[PDB]
Design a protein around this ligand. Structure first.
Ligand SMILES: NC(=O)NC(=O)NC(N)=O
Ligand SMILES: NC(=O)NC(=O)NC(N)=O
Lengths: 219, 220
């Protein structure tokens, strides 16, 4: 077992029953002119974590852990895009509309792709999800149970939306989750750090958090 | 059709396709000596909202809307309690241990019941759930789809745990959700306030929020 100094108390895992889950590291969130921009955000904060996420991905690959990537995305015919989601916020350019990187939040479009610095490789799971939570309308739980995974390392964007939603879903399903604090980011400084504090409050109610350097020290 | 002044913009619903969801208003969270106390919390902040939650339940009953109550609970043999949840925080008294109101977070025990002042009546749906989210390992989505429910009014405790987890799950499943801000509470006032702000940020990314007075104004 590997023991990591973590908040609120040490986190122990075995690499062979652990998966790294990298959430939504897509141009649609990190680059100007995609879905994140369409919602009225300044997307600039997210790019800062890309080298840290790359270092985490290399750590997981070198340890022989399962790597899972998620993409928030819709079928090109939008048959998995609820009308509520399409209308929310009355956006000028919405899901499926053509922006500078193609149709916003649609599978197969350039703007929907994972950044090349963090791209999946053969042997990794890639989950397209129509909501913020990685477990809703996906086979992620079944895929992790088939591989006897018990522990999840969690990274990606945004901290208070897809990352926290996915970690809360995983906690309910019995996974032991460690969020890598400097491998996550938000459009809002108002939301990033306090989301991490909520997740680990009350003796770890949703799970654990630590910086990448503490994980690197364990492996 | 009813139109409510809300954040970030007005919320419209029809009573026939709307449900009120009251989350985890249980002695285990609101009274001293249950699960909330066992996790090291001062549980006193939650009692302040009980009259507001009771007024919201009366409003939904008078409108003839479906009412859903959730209870965070486990089977007496703890077969639906993941080992992770049993071990987390290494509490001195954990899930299934005997506190002053019986076995902590277990179905059928006095401390696991909904407060009598917020109890269900005949014709309301009562969902026992083993997690913080109301949709995980429950039939809630199927029960709402059978009744053609599209809109949810949301209340209960705690704001940053079961309330936000259930509202995020509902949003992913295509529901339009309005959280009644003064009918929710947390052990941590900062986590209450910030959770409400993040749910409605970015043009309503998870849903809407408004105080009970604005909802009362829309049905008057
Ligand atoms: N808007 C925002 O903060 N997040 C999303 O819409 N999705 C994800 N991935 O977090
Ligand atoms: N501990 C805490 O804040 N909440 C819970 O454990 N469950 C609910 N219902 O929110």
């Amino acid at each position: 077992m590997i023991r990591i100094d973590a908040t609120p108390y040490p986190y122990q895992f075995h690499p062979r029953s652990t998966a790294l889950v990298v959430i939504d590291m897509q141009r649609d969130f990190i680059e100007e002119g995609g879905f994140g921009s369409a919602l009225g955000n300044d997307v600039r904060p997210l790019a800062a974590i890309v080298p840290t996420v790359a270092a985490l991905l290399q750590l997981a690959r070198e340890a022989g852990m399962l790597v899972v990537h998620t993409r928030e995305s819709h079928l090109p015919d939008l048959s998995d895009c609820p009308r509520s989601k399409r209308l929310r916020g009355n956006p000028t350019l919405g899901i499926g509309d053509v922006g500078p990187m193609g149709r916003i939040l649609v599978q197969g479009e350039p703007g929907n792709q994972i950044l090349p610095q963090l791209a999946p490789v053969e042997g990794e799971l890639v989950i397209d999800k129509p909501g913020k939570g990685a477990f809703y309308a996906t086979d992620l739980h079944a895929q992790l149970q088939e591989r006897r995974i018990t522990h999840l390392l969690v990274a990606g964007v945004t901290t208070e939306v897809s990352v926290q939603t996915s970690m809360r879903e995983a906690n309910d399903r019995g996974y032991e989750c460690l969020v890598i604090e400097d491998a996550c980011a938000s459009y809002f400084p108002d939301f990033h750090r306090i989301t991490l504090e909520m997740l680990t409050a009350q003796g770890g109610i949703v799970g654990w958090r630590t910086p990448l350097a503490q994980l690197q020290a364990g492996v």
